[PDB]
A paper describes a structure:
The Commander complex is required for endosomal recycling of diverse transmembrane cargos and is mutated in Ritscher-Schinzel syndrome. It comprises two sub-assemblies: Retriever composed of VPS35L, VPS26C, and VPS29; and the CCC complex which contains twelve subunits: COMMD1-COMMD10 and the coiled-coil domain-containing (CCDC) proteins CCDC22 and CCDC93. The COMMD proteins form a distinctive hetero-decameric ring stabilized by extensive interactions with CCDC22 and CCDC93. These adopt a coiled-coil structure that connects the CCC and Retriever assemblies and recruits a 16th subunit, DENND10, to form the complete Commander complex.
While each COMMD subcomplex was relatively stable, only subcomplex C produced an X-ray crystal structure (3.3 Å resolution), revealing a 1:1:1:1 heterotetrameric assembly formed by COMMD5-COMMD10 and COMMD7-COMMD9 heterodimers. The four COMM domains form an intimately assembled core structure with HN domains of COMMD9 and COMMD10 located peripherally. No clear densities of COMMD5 or COMMD7 HN domains were seen, presumably due to flexibility. Notably, the structure closely matches that predicted by AlphaFold2 multimer. The COMMD5-COMMD10 and COMMD7-COMMD9 dimers interact primarily via an extended β-sheet augmentation between COMMD5 and COMMD7 COMM domains. Two critical contacts involve Leu129 in COMMD10 and the analogous Ile118 in COMMD9; these lie within the respective linkers between the HN and COMM domains. The linkers position these sidechains to reach across the tetramer interface and fit into complementary pockets on the distal COMMD7 and COMMD5 subunits, respectively. In addition, the two HN domains themselves interact with the other three respective subunits. For clarity, we describe these two interfaces as centered around Trp157 of COMMD5 and Trp139 of COMMD7, as these Trp residues are the only residues that are strictly conserved across all homologues and species of every COMMD protein. In both interfaces, a serine in the β1-β2 loop forms a stacking interaction with the sidechain and a hydrogen bond with the backbone NH of the strictly conserved tryptophan residue of the neighboring COMM domain; Ser148 of COMMD7 forms a stacking and backbone hydrogen bond with Trp157 of COMMD5, while in the second interface, Ser166 of COMMD5 forms a stacking interaction and hydrogen bond with Trp139 of COMMD7.
Numbering used by the authors:
A (entry chain N): 5 to 134, 143 to 198
B (entry chain T): 12 to 44, 53 to 202
C (entry chain F): 149 to 223
D (entry chain S): 131 to 200
């Protein structure tokens, strides 16, 4: 929107190329509802108001998220977003900084994309019971903080595999690695 | 298949007139997961009867996994010494309900929570005066989130202004653009 | 009654499963976070997504009509 | 404690998401069916392919260590 483009010009008050660079990185990575924590220090950066600074950070956040979303990998495709009457040297600076991060930003989002609960660590032990062997399969699961509640994000599961059930599991892990070959046959 | 050897003799001897009724019942069982009546009808003790049920299920579960053609199924059946008259019943039953059986397994979600019911209603407030306040309608959405682990619905209610629901619509249109890119 | 605080998805196609070698059947995973701080994650079959997508189109049309009728009410 | 009884999985590729239009990432979801004390539980897990092969490789190491007895 026009309000976003008006806000981005506030970067012309910046003190270094890195200040623009760091604000781009931070505006992408903090969540849309979460940007607020830097507002005063951002205000002191550029000497802007808090209300201007929130719209600035939202403008960068929308711009960087949209660029990451479409995987815009040429300057003309990024430059085409900007109006004819928009400061050329600023848009060149923003375009460069975008191309410096778009691979990184797109990867960062793919690391935090939604899923079922994610394995984060794994351990195992073999142990002879009163005699017969058993495996104590120990997994750490990481659930999304938004959704586990006030429970911890990281929860540990521990499973007894017997020799018989371990064979049934490896038969399943077998078929998976086989299925992972037969794709697009015939 | 040394284990199969017992089942092939047991199934071949089973009453062919009663056989299609049981196959249909097991197929009905397969989209998800009376014994005394079967024990008396098929003259098998509980442990003996189960081997037949387990063998039929395993045959159907293997058949669905590979989406075997009727000619392909009979090719495997003729190799394991099953008599054709039982094979004819299997192939007939498979040829009709097969694709629909596979489609359910193709549709069945793994994850625990699945959206089951969608309900919308719309709520309105009314302005006969010159300006009491120029106030919008708002919609509410009933989501029936089936916790299929339990089969307990969470009936989830979310409310939208026109100012919001259009933003939500553009996201669903983005999902549709992604979902149509699968072509 | 809570409004949507965040709405998030991924579009998946299942290639193989424990009981089907080659399913190729897609689904949309949804995650909602809401204004009361509740959150939900659920998987939507394509048929149920088309229902939801079509339903939003109706309710938008009614809301935009009733909104427009209020201008007719000022006239 | 927590004796496994059965397993399921879904293997697929991710076409897109909220943050990325075209994604192409590849995922394995597992459903583990567990018991304690005559009540079942389902445990749900999602894995990248590196985590699958490492999960497979390590569970193979267990099999070598278990068949070693009787």
């Amino acid at each position: 929107t026009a309000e976003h483009f008006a806000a981005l010009q506030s970067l012309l008050k910046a003190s270094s190329k890195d200040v623009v660079r760091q604000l781009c990185q931070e505006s992408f990575s903090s969540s849309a509802l979460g940007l607020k924590k830097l507002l005063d220090v951002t205000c002191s950066s550029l000497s802007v108001t808090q209300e201007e600074a929130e719209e600035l950070l939202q403008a960068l956040h929308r711009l960087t998220r949209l660029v990451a979303f479409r995987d815009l990998s040429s300057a003309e495709a990024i430059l085409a977003l900007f109006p004819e009457n928009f400061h050329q040297n600023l848009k060149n600076l923003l375009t460069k900084i975008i191309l410096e991060h778009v691979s990184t930003w797109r990867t960062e989002a793919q690391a935090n994309q939604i899923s079922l609960p994610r394995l984060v660590d794994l351990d195992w032990r073999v142990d002879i019971k009163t005699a017969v062997p058993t495996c104590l399969l120990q997994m750490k699961i990481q659930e999304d903080p938004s959704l586990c509640g006030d429970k911890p994000s990281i929860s540990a599961v521990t499973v007894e595999l017997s020799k018989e059930t371990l064979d049934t599991m490896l038969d399943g892990l077998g078929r998976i690695r086989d299925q992972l070959s037969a794709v697009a046959s015939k | 298949s040394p284990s199969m050897k017992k089942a092939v003799s047991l199934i071949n001897a089973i009453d062919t007139g009663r056989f299609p009724r049981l196959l249909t019942r097991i197929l009905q069982k397969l989209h998800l997961k009376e014994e005394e009546k079967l024990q008396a009808a098929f003259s098998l003790e509980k442990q003996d009867l189960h081997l037949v049920l387990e063998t039929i299920s395993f045959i159907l579960e293997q058949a669905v996994y590979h989406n075997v053609k009727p000619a392909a199924l009979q090719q495997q059946l003729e190799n394991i010494h099953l008599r054709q008259d039982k094979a004819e019943a299997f192939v007939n039953t498979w040829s009709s309900m097969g694709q629909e059986t596979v489609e359910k397994f193709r549709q069945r979600i793994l994850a625990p929570c699945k959206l089951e019911t969608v309900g919308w209603q719309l709520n309105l407030q009314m302005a006969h005066s010159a300006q009491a306040k120029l106030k919008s309608p708002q919609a509410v959405l009933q989501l029936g989130v089936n916790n299929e682990d339990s089969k307990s619905l969470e009936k989830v209610l979310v409310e939208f202004s026109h100012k919001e629901l259009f933003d939500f619509y553009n996201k669903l249109e983005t999902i549709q653009a992604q979902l149509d890119s699968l072509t | 009654l809570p409004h949507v605080a965040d709405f998030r998805w991924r579009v998946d196609v299942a290639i193989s499963t424990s009981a089907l070698a080659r399913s190729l059947q897609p689904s949309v995973l949804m995650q909602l976070k809401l204004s009361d701080g509740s959150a939900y994650r659920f998987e939507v079959p394509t048929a149920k997504f088309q229902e939801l997508r079509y339903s939003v189109a109706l309710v938008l049309k009614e809301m935009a009509d009733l909104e427009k009728r209020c201008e007719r009410r000022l006239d | 404690i927590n004796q496994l009884i059965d397993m399921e999985w879904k293997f697929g590729v991710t076409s897109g998401s909220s943050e990325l239009e075209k994604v192409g990432s590849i995922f394995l979801q597992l459903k583990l069916v567990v018991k304690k004390g005559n009540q079942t539980e389902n445990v749900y897990i999602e894995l990248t392919l590196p985590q699958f092969y490492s999960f497979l490789h390590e569970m193979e190491r267990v099999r070598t260590s278990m068949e070693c007895f009787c």
